[PDB]
Write a protein that binds this DNA or RNA. Structure first.
Lengths: 136, 53, 177, 59, 74, 104
RNA sequence: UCCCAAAAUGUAACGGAGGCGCCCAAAGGUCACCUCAAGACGGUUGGAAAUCGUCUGUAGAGCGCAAAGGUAGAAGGUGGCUUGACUGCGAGACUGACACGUCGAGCAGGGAGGAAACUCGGGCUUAGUGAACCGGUGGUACCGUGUGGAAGGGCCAUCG
RNA sequence: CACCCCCGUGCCCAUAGCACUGUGGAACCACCCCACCCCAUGCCGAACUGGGUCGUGAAACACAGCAGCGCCAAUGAUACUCGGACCGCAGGGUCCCGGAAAAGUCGGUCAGCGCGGGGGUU
């Protein structure tokens, strides 16, 4: 989740979904249908749940690592700086972007993992199979 | 161009027999004893200037 | 004073064995380089005044104070300051020094069975492991101060290490036996 | 005003105003040689409009 | 903290296919972007100024080096 | 190293000077001593020590100096300046100089 | 100085990061030559880093300082000679409400380097700063109150 | 440019570059040749530099082969967008019209165009 080394602070914007795929790194995968920021802890949630369902593994891939320092108002008011370094880090996610990829388990075994992990998400999602090869 | 207790200096200037003020920034740090250069006075121009004073 | 034994007694011995199309493709020798590491652990601007003497004695040539590389890391290090001594030897002086070693300095050494036979420069050049300085013709305990040592890199026109080893083996290259 | 006479507000024959270059006059020098001769002739006619009025009747 | 969005100025003053005069300032730059070509000088601040009167030649080599020149109009 | 020449070659500014530049190839025993135009991609005078050294070696310097200067005399070339490659302007090249100089 | 700044210039914020109030008798002028960081095998004070050796090497270094731009044909790194860190000037443009500020071919008195073309009116540029006033100081000889002088003042430097 | 070719020097400043490599040898070129003085290497004539042939084309330079690597790179379709209209509480998204990349794929290359001089066609 939270990154190791940086500069400081950030802005915010929304484009299309660029770096990210339909598939890779495994058999099935979950993809975001809605533009958002994803909290580090939210990923930790999807992760931990999917790791609840797969007792053993190494078949879980999260392409979604967040780096976006966000700052929030400390207690109250206005007079003062723009401040508040540590609130949380997020990973902007735009539709089509691959969120999760899991492999080695069944159809159903993917379905449920994605449902549970999906209920932890601020946005819509869906699971798919593979056809297309863009790059390699 | 500010002045005080500090190192270097702004040292005034004059010639052999010729009357002219260069006023250039000198420095006592590495070496300052001879402020000697070649500069050009009122008329003749073409002289050695001892800025030592 | 040598330089002939080079041509006559080396070059054909190669073409007798190797047999290049031409005598210019024959393995040759570019220069002998002498670098005296100083400073750091043992550092005296007086000891450089001392070193330059013995270093200008054996070779009949001036040395040069080599400053630092601006490498500053952890232990004692700086910008620039003499870190060592350098002498390059080409031509008759290269040969005078070299043979002064092969015939004299090398044969008389304590615990000397040869020099390291193993591959040094994969492109066919060579180096030396000189340690004690009491093994030299122009340095004996009659006149001395302390005990240090020197390094010698040997440059050739050789292609591989296999050929150059033989090259040095002409003037002789004592190995581990 | 009546102070500004000998200082240059000075008026020309075309009814223009003489204000040249101030860049360094007395204190604080020791840069170049022609910034020192940077002292000029000069003017602008924007604030020349109400300038003369300081000097008005005594040309 | 924060302070000083700086004025600077820069830009390229006289653009291509423009007829200049001797003494006009063609380019205001910082380093050497635009090298002074034939008919063109470069000040100490690497400003490009005109030696003689004529027309403005722009020369593009793939950048990294490019040239402001002055060719005669007459 | 090979920029030793491009140093002087780029150094000489013809277009601003208006003059013609004088190339000399000092390599060993043969010198080209060509005369080249500022603007156009042409070459004008160009004598050389290539033929008829007649026993001279680096002494042919003065020779191609006179020969060149004479060839350019039949041109109307007066203003010129001296290019070179890696060369030092010391002994031989100074001979080509002074010999193509007095014979301007 | 960079970002915001919406591919011209410009643009606010108690918006986001870092610096200046210096220094340099040369870190300048010119003239000549040298090419860097780094990785790999191989060398006695090494055993990550020292010095040397060869192999690779658009620079991944370097430029007193902060960044961006710039820089391999040098602005980087040694030396020779020197006082252009000049005087009297400005064709013409950048820029500013103004006052300032900036760059600059070229004329002359003259210099310094180079064989020569030629370069030089400080420094790779960009920060290292302050109007007037009152006064200290050197030079020049205009004013100087009946006249001849002086006091005082003025102009060119220049210090606070 | 009648032609082969070598030497100097340009325009073009990587589709003109490196590597694997084959040809060149007494015409040019290169090293090697010796060096008290010119001149000179913070030490070494290695590099400058000064006196010349033999020897050799090895290396360097020169040319020809070669598309492994570099560089060049469509068409198609996008992303985005001036202008014209709109949806959504919002994050954001669409439609009509023009303009229109970046990457990638096809494929294209190992250049091209000058000046001058020297030497060949027994």
């Amino acid at each position: 989740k939270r990154t190791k080394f940086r500069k400081q602070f950030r802005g915010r914007m929304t484009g299309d979904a660029k770096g990210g795929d339909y598939v890779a790194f495994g058999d099935y995968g979950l993809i975001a249908m809605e533009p958002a920021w994803i909290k580090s802890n939210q990923i930790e949630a999807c992760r931990i749940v999917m790791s609840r369902h797969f007792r053993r593994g190494g078949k879980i891939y999260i392409r979604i690592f967040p780096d976006k320092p966000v700052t929030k108002k400390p207690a109250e008011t206005r007079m003062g700086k723009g401040k508040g370094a540590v609130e949380y880090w997020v990973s902007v996610v735009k539709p089509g972007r691959v969120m999760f990829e899991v492999a080695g388990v069944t159809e159903e075994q993917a379905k449920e993992a994605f449902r549970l992990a999906g209920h932890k998400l601020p946005i819509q999602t869906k699971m798919v199979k593979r056809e297309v090869y863009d790059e390699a | 161009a500010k002045d005080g207790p500090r190192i270097i200096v702004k040292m005034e200037s004059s010639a052999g027999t010729g009357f002219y003020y260069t006023t250039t920034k000198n420095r006592r740090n590495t070496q300052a004893k001879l402020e000697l250069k070649k500069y050009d006075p009122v008329a003749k121009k073409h002289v050695v200037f001892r800025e030592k004073k | 004073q040598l330089k002939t034994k080079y041509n006559d007694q080396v070059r054909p011995a190669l073409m007798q064995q190797f047999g290049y199309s031409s005598v210019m493709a024959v393995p040759r020798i570019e220069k002998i380089v002498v670098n005296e590491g100083l400073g750091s652990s043992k550092e005296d601007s007086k000891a450089i005044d001392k070193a330059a003497k013995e270093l200008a004695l054996i070779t009949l040539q001036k040395p040069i104070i080599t400053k630092a590389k601006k490498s500053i890391s952890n232990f004692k290090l700086r910008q620039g300051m003499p870190v060592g001594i350098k002498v390059t030897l080409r031509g008759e002086r290269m040969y005078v020094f070299l043979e002064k070693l092969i015939n004299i300095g090398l044969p008389r050494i304590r615990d000397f069975r040869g020099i390291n036979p193993n591959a040094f420069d994969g492109r066919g050049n060579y180096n030396l492991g000189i340690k004690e300085q009491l093994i030299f013709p122009e340095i004996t305990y009659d006149m001395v101060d302390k005990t240090r040592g020197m390094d010698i890199t040997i440059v050739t026109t050789a292609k591989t290490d296999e050929e150059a080893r033989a090259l040095l083996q002409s003037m002789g290259l004592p190995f581990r036996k | 005003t009546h102070k500004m006479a000998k200082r240059r507000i000075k008026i020309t024959g075309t009814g223009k105003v003489m204000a040249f270059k101030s860049g360094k006059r007395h204190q604080n020098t020791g840069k170049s040689g022609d910034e020192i001769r940077g002292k000029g002739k000069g003017f602008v006619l924007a604030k020349a409009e109400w300038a003369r009025m300081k000097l008005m009747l005594p040309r | 903290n924060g302070r000083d969005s700086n004025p600077k100025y820069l830009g390229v003053k006289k653009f291509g296919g423009e007829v200049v005069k001797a003494g006009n300032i063609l380019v205001r730059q910082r380093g050497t972007k635009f090298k002074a070509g034939q008919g063109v000088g470069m000040g100490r601040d690497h400003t490009l100024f005109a030696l003689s009167d004529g027309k403005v030649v722009f020369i593009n080599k793939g950048k990294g080096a490019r040239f402001i020149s002055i060719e005669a109009a007459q | 190293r090979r920029k030793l020449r491009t140093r002087r070659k780029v150094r000489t500014t013809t277009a601003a000077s208006g003059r013609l530049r004088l190339s000399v190839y000092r390599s060993s025993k043969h010198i080209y001593a060509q005369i080249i135009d500022d603007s156009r991609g042409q070459t004008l005078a160009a004598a050389s020590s290539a033929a008829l050294k007649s026993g001279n070696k680096t002494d042919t310097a003065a020779a191609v100096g006179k020969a060149l200067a004479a060839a350019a005399a039949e041109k109307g070339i007066k203003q010129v300046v001296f290019d070179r490659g890696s060369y030092k302007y010391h002994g031989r090249v100074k001979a080509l100089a002074d010999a193509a100089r007095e014979g301007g």
